[PDB]
Design a protein around this ligand. Sequence first.
Ligand SMILES: Oc1c(Cl)cccc1Cl
Ligand SMILES: Oc1c(Cl)cccc1Cl
Ligand code: SF4
Ligand code: SF4
Ligand code: SF4
Ligand code: SF4
Lengths: 441, 419
Amino acid sequence: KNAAEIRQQFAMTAGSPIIVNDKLERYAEVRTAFTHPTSFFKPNYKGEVKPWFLSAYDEKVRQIENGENGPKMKAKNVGEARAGRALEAAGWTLDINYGNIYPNRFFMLWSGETMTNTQLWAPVGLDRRPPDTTDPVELTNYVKFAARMAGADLVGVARLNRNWVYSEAVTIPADVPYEQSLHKEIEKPIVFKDVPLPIETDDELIIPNTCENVIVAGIAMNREMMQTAPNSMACATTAFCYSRMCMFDMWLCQFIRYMGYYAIPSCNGVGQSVAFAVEAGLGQASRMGACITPEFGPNVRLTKVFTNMPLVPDKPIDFGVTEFCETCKKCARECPSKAITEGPRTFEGRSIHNQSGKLQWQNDYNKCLGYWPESGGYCGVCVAVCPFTKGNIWIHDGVEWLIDNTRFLNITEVWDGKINTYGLDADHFRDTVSFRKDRVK
Amino acid sequence: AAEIRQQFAMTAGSPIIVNDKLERYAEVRTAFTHPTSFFKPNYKGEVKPWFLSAYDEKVRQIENGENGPKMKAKNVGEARAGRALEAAGWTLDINYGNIYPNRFFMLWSGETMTNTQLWAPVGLDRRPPDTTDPVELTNYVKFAARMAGADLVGVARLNRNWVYSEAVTIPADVPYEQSLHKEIEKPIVFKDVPLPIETDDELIIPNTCENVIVAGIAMNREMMQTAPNSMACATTAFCYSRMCMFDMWLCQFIRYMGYYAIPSCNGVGQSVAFAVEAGLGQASRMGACITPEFGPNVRLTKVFTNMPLVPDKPIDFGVTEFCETCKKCARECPSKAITEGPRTFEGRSIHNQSGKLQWQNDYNKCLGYWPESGGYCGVCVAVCPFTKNITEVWDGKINTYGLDADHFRDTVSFRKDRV
Ligand SMILES: Oc1c(Cl)cccc1Cl
Ligand SMILES: Oc1c(Cl)cccc1Cl
Ligand code: SF4
Ligand code: SF4
Ligand code: SF4
Ligand code: SF4
């Protein structure tokens, strides 16, 4: 199996693959089901209406008390139930309020000047010296090498399509301390202006018009843990990867800054990761709505960094995902909340949570979020059942690579079973080896 | 690899031979911190803190298009990129090694952390442990350790001989910008208290703090082989930030299981001794812990806890006898810091802890080469048999976190090999 061959075989010609029409407008981040008032509140198992994550907390507590790893899923004993939630909670250690979405706060600073690392290194002046390399070809090789050092299992580059940048971000005022953050969230416009550096004013988050490129990283989750969806160990691989995302953004932004350019981190903030990932060639959009990659299927998290560093955009990829999703529908049939549509793609949003004006399968994400308090986790059944999440999809017929159509026709054992560093799998880790030829052409 | 480690397991008992002279070692005595070794001249002849003199050499090298001492880069751009990667790798590390205990990332309680506050309604850190079985806990915590980025993990009873008698730290209210100028010494003591606690006068570890969990964090072979040049600095630096994330992740897991946990990175005590007692590897002539999987090309961090655990067995795969006749690190060392002589119980200088049988090296000679070369050397690690240009590294093989898929299978783990 040769992942590089596969990507070469299915590479497209240049151009954003996402089909759009005239009703497309940039999307206010507050509209996501996590944040919007119509979906933010959910009942707990006692019928009390709370912020959804607090209702989910109540269900986690109830499951531990009852020795369960998930809804109606008995654990080996209470200690096993306890251990799954402890692993999940610890995974979030380097993530603020589930996703690091507030731009230019906490870990997501838009300038490195106040960071302890920048201060320590200031006598070398790497962040003030003009770039010594401006060649996009060399820069792309350098920045992708750095990206792999920084924990990315996949990395791609695209020109920044502003359609996918949130019109307004969810954030907090700069004078609000952490313990009040969840009570003091606000909206703030993201605007593009003729300014030298990313800068935040009292009224606006300002991205320079020179911010040409976006670097997208894929952060692979653990197959065995995700297959326990919707139970606790799927929550744990999700959580650990959010902290890997945060480390990646900070590492990479600092490299870019020390190369003489600016860099904006984001994790789950700033813009829509799936669209950037598609335009950067990591994978294709899917019925469930995730980016499906050849290496990991949808079982991979995304983050991204925006920069004026000259780079060579990668080519999009088309390995037949749209055509398999047309006939598969497994995620839609298994979804415990019936959130995923079984119908065709449209340009018309299903509800406020969807951005209209782009051709996609339109899913009801309030229904999805509604299952999270009920199950006490982050579900993931769609990711777990997707055939592309299986590690064994690719076959070679003597001429070229193809997808095996036959693929589309417990937690104690996970704790006692195979694991490796960062939950990566040595049986497949060769798929993400990288030489210069697969970083830049 | 799991076969090899079981083949070479020793019977229980610390393999470090000590005498009646041994005393705990004050952290300020390391060459990084001690007043006799801290100040070094830069290439212009100006005496500065050693790392500021090293900074000056990094700038001079970038300006001259060099990747290291007398090592021309392909161009100035390549020189710049190696130093930018090095500087970036340190992002999650305070002042080179995170040594100040109970400051910044190294908090001895989880209570004030943003993650603990967000998770407070679940009460995992306040709920008594549901598991007290050391067998099950060893399996759980080792699984978590691998999730947290350890390539190797072992457990030993805590030997207080390797805990620093006094830590280097800063006053609690000193802002970061003044930290380097306000470092102080502070005793680490053990007392009958329920939880790790810091007073004005003391860092207090509970007498119940029975165990230490030691993690090995593998460095990249291609990059370390550029020692003493900039790409060896870069793999060193990234692994320090991996160490910090490991400590915080694992401490939070242990706390959410009902126990307490003290992170440390390069602080609190001597990592090499803990790693040997936990069975990760054997002490060596250069002074590092040599592991079967990575030789010495692996960083160490460790977490201290009262969580019940099953100690691992020390390992003997012949390192002492091989180092007896090898001496390659000693012959290649650019500062002649590593001895070609036999092991003794008497240190060569203030930087060594006397009273334990080891090869005694002159660590002020080692440090003196760092401002000269503008990096963190590592030639000894690079040339060591157990470990086995810069443009070719940048254009060549890489994978996630610098790990190597040709060897990654060696660190696969099932419960059989966890406990
Ligand atoms: O994206 C997530 C957020 Cl923002 C919160 C909890 C779980 C997930 Cl997967
Ligand atoms: O341990 C180190 C410290 Cl403490 C500073 C710089 C480089 C290294 Cl390897
Ligand atoms: S489960 Fe099937 S329909 Fe759903 S995303 Fe995967 S391939 Fe597409
Ligand atoms: S996460 Fe669960 S509830 Fe949400 S779309 Fe996927 S299967 Fe459905
Ligand atoms: S790091 Fe370099 S100078 Fe120091 S002991 Fe090793 S070879 Fe010698
Ligand atoms: S180079 Fe030889 S003598 Fe030095 S640590 Fe390695 S095996 Fe031992």
